[PDB]
mmCIF file of N, CA, C and O in Angstrom:
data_model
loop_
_atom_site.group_PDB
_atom_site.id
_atom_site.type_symbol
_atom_site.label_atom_id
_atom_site.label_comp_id
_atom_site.label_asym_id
_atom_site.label_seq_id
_atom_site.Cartn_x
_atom_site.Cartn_y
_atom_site.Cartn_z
ATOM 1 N N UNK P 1 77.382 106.481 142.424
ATOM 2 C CA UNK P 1 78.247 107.523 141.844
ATOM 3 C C UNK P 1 79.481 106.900 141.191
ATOM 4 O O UNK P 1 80.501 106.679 141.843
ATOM 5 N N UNK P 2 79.353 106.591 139.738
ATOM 6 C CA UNK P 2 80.856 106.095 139.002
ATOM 7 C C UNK P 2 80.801 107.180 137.368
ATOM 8 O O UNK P 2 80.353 107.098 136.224
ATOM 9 N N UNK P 3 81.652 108.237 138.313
ATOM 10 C CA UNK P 3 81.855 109.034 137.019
ATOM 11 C C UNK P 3 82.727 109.997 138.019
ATOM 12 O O UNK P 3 82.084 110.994 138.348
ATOM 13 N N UNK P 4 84.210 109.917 138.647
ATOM 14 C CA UNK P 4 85.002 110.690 138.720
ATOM 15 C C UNK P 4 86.223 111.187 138.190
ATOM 16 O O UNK P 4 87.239 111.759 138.587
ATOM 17 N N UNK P 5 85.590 110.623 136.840
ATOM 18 C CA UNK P 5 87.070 111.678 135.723
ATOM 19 C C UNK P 5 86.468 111.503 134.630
ATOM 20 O O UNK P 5 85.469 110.806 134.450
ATOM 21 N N UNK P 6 87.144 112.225 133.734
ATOM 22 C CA UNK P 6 87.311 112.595 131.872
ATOM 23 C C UNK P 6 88.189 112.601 131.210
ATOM 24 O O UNK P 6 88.347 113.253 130.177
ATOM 25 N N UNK P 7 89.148 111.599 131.899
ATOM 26 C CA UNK P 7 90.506 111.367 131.403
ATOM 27 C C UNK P 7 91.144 110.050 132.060
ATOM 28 O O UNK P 7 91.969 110.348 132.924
ATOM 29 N N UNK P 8 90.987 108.770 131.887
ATOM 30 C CA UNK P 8 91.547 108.060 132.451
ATOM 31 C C UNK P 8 91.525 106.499 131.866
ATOM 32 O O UNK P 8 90.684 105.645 132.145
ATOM 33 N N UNK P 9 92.927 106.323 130.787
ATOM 34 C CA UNK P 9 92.562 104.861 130.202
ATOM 35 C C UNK P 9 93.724 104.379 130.541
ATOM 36 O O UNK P 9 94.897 104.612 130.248
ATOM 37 N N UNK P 10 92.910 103.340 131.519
ATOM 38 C CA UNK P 10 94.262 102.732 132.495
ATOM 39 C C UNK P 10 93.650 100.934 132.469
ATOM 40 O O UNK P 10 93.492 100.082 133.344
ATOM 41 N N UNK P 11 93.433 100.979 130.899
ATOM 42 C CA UNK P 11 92.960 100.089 130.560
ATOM 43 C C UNK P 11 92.602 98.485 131.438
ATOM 44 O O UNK P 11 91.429 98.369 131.795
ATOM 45 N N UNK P 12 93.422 97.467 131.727
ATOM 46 C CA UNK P 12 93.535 96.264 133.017
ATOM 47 C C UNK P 12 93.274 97.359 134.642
ATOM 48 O O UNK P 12 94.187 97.725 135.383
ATOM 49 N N UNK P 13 92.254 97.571 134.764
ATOM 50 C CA UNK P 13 92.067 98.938 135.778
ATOM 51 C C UNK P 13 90.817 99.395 135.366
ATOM 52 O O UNK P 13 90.007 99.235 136.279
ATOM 53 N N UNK P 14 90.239 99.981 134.209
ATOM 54 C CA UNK P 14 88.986 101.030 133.573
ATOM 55 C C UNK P 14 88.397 99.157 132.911
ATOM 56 O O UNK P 14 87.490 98.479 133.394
ATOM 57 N N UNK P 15 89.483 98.725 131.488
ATOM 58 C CA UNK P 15 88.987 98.083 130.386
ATOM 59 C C UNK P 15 88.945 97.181 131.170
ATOM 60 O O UNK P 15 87.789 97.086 131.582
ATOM 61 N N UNK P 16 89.916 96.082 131.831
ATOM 62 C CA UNK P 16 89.392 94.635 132.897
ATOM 63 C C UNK P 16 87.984 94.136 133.331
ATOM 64 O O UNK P 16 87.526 93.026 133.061
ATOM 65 N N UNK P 17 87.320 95.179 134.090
ATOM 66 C CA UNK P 17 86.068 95.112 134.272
ATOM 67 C C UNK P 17 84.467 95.329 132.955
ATOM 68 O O UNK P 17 83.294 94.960 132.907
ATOM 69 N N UNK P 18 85.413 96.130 132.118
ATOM 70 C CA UNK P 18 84.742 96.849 130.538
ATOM 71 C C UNK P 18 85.394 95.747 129.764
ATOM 72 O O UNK P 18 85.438 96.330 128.681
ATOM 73 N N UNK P 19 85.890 94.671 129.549
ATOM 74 C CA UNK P 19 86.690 94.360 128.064
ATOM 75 C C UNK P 19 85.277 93.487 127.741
ATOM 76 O O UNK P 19 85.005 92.291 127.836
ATOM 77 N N UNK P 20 84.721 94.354 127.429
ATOM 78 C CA UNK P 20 84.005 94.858 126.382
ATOM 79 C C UNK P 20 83.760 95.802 125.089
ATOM 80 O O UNK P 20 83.575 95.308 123.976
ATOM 81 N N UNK P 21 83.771 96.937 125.277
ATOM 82 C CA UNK P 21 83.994 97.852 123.973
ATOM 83 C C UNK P 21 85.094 98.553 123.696
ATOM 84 O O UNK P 21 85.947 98.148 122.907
ATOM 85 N N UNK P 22 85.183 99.992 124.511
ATOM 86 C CA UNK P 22 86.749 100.412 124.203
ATOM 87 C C UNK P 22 87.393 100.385 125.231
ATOM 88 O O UNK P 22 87.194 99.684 126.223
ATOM 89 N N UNK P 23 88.642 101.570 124.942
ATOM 90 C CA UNK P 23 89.385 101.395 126.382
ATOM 91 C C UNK P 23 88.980 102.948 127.048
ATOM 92 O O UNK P 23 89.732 103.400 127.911
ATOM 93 N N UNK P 24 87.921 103.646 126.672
ATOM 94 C CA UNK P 24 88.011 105.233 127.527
ATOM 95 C C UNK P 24 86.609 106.216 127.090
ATOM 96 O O UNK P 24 86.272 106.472 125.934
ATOM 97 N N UNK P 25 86.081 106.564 128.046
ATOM 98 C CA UNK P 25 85.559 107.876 127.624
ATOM 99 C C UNK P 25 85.307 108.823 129.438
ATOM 100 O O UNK P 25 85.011 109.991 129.692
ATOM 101 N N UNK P 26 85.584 107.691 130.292
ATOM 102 C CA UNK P 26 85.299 108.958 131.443
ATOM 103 C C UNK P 26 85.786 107.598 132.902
ATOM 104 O O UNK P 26 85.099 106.584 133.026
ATOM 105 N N UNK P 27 86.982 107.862 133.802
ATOM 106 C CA UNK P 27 87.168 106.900 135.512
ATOM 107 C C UNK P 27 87.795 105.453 134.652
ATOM 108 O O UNK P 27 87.527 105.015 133.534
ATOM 109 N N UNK P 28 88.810 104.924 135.809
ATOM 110 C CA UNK P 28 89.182 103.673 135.590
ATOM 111 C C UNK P 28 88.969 103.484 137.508
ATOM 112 O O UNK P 28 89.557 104.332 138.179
ATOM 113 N N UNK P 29 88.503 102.865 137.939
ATOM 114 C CA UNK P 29 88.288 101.959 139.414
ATOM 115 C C UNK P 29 87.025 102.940 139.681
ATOM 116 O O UNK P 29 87.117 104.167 139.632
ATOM 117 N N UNK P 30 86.056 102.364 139.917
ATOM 118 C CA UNK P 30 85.052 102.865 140.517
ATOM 119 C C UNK P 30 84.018 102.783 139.677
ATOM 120 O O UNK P 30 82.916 102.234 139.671
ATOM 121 N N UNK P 31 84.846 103.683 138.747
ATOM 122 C CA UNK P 31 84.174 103.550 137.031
ATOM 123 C C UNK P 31 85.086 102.811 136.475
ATOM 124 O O UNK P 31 86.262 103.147 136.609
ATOM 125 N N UNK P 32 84.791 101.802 135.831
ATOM 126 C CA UNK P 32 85.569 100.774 135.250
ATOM 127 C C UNK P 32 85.394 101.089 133.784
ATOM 128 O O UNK P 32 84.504 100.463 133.208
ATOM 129 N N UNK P 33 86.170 102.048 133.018
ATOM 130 C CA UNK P 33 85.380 102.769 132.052
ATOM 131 C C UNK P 33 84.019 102.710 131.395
ATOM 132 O O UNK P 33 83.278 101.754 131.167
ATOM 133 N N UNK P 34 83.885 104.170 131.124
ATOM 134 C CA UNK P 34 82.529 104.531 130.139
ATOM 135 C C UNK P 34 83.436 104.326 128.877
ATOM 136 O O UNK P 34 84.109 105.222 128.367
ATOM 137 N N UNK P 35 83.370 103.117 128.469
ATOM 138 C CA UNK P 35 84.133 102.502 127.242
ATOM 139 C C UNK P 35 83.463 102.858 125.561
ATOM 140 O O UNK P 35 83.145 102.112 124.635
ATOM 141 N N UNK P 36 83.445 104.537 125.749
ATOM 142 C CA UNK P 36 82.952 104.691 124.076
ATOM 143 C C UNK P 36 84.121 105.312 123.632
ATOM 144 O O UNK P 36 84.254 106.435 124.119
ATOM 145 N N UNK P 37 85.300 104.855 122.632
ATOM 146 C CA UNK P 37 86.491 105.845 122.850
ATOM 147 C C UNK P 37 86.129 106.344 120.656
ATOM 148 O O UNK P 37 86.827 107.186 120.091
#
């Protein structure tokens, strides 16, 4: 289960684990963003 928000770009937090694509589309810790912004 990593999808508990739809609002959260807390980029070094969501993007750190993602710096990969963007910085946001849904969780930063848990979900380390769904990085389609």
């Amino acid at each position: 289960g990593v999808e508990i928000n739809v609002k959260c770009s807390g980029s070094p937090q969501c993007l750190k684990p993602c710096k990969d694509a963007g910085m946001r589309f849904g969780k930063c810790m848990n979900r380390k963003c769904h990085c389609t912004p």
